[PDB]
Design an enzyme around this catalytic site. Sequence first.
Site, short mmCIF file in Angstrom:
data_model
loop_
_atom_site.label_atom_id
_atom_site.label_comp_id
_atom_site.label_asym_id
_atom_site.label_seq_id
_atom_site.Cartn_x
_atom_site.Cartn_y
_atom_site.Cartn_z
N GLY A 1 48.64 160.56 -54.81
CA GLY A 1 48.48 161.46 -55.93
C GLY A 1 48.45 160.70 -57.23
O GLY A 1 48.74 159.50 -57.28
N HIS B 1 50.80 151.44 -51.11
CA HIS B 1 49.82 151.05 -52.09
C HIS B 1 50.44 151.15 -53.48
O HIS B 1 50.33 150.22 -54.28
CB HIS B 1 48.58 151.92 -51.98
CG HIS B 1 47.50 151.57 -52.95
ND1 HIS B 1 47.27 152.31 -54.09
CD2 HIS B 1 46.58 150.57 -52.96
CE1 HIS B 1 46.26 151.79 -54.76
NE2 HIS B 1 45.82 150.73 -54.10
N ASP C 1 44.21 147.81 -52.79
CA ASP C 1 43.26 148.87 -52.53
C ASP C 1 42.65 148.76 -51.14
O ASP C 1 42.50 149.76 -50.43
CB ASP C 1 42.15 148.83 -53.59
CG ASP C 1 42.70 148.91 -54.99
OD1 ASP C 1 43.51 149.82 -55.26
OD2 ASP C 1 42.34 148.08 -55.83
C1 LIG Z 1 47.81 153.57 -54.82
C2 LIG Z 1 47.28 154.80 -54.08
O1 LIG Z 1 47.34 154.76 -52.83
C3 LIG Z 1 46.73 155.95 -54.69
C4 LIG Z 1 46.26 157.03 -53.91
C5 LIG Z 1 45.72 158.16 -54.53
C6 LIG Z 1 45.63 158.24 -55.94
BR1 LIG Z 1 44.89 159.78 -56.74
C7 LIG Z 1 46.09 157.17 -56.73
C8 LIG Z 1 46.64 156.04 -56.10
#
Ligand SMILES: *CC(=O)c1ccc(Br)cc1
Lengths: 121, 121
Positions: free
Chosen positions: A29, A47, A89
């Site tokens: 999110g 992540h 990523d």
């Molecule tokens: C870092 C990560 O996994 C991630 C996933 C979705 C959104 Br929106 C922002 C960051």
Amino acid sequence: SLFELGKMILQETGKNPAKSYGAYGCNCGVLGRGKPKDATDRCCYVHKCCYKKLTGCNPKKDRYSYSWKDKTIVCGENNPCLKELCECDKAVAICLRENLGTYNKLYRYHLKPFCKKADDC
Amino acid sequence: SLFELGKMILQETGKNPAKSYGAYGCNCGVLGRGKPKDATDRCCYVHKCCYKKLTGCNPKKDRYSYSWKDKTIVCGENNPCLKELCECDKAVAICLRENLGTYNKLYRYHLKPFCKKADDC
Ligand SMILES: *CC(=O)c1ccc(Br)cc1
Ligand SMILES: *CC(=O)c1ccc(Br)cc1
């Protein structure tokens, strides 16, 4: 930048990045980490934690170079930060792909209150 | 931060912030700006431009306080930046509401590539 991320996720998962991981669980999110609701969420937690350990680049607005080689996300960066950032990523895109099997659409737009305070990275 | 913003959007639009505006058009997203696909999308565009103007606070992370007096978002912050930020969020919530009439669900999870480069703010 989430541009690359979006591209990676789309390349790995083949799923609409925002539609599927723009708001999933407590971590996939825009805002904050929450203790993972499932594997897919754990990817984003990891992540987001990956982003945290970053120093020297903006995980959101720093565009890095990577390429699709033999259907593999290949980071084309030497800058330690971008390299890692790109690897963050990639790992998430891959992870997310690897966890589509347990992807539950119910966790979409999962309200933050139902989220516990995530451990520390 | 997105928290307040979301809240405001909810208060004004009555619509679920993440579902309706977490990923709509070329601007109601985590990415940057892109030529707006419609009114709704133009709101966010303006709103992102609005953020650019901010110096002294992070529009994403920095939380702030505002009141909901007489069904009206009243920015209570006295701190310039936060006040400005709040106002920015208030404006988008308002604008979103005003354009709820032409909200088109087909713009949800719109892909960025398919987004015209936005003119500089
Ligand atoms: C870092 C990560 O996994 C991630 C996933 C979705 C959104 Br929106 C922002 C960051
Ligand atoms: C600034 C703005 O309108 C906006 C809308 C949605 C998301 Br997600 C972030 C920012």
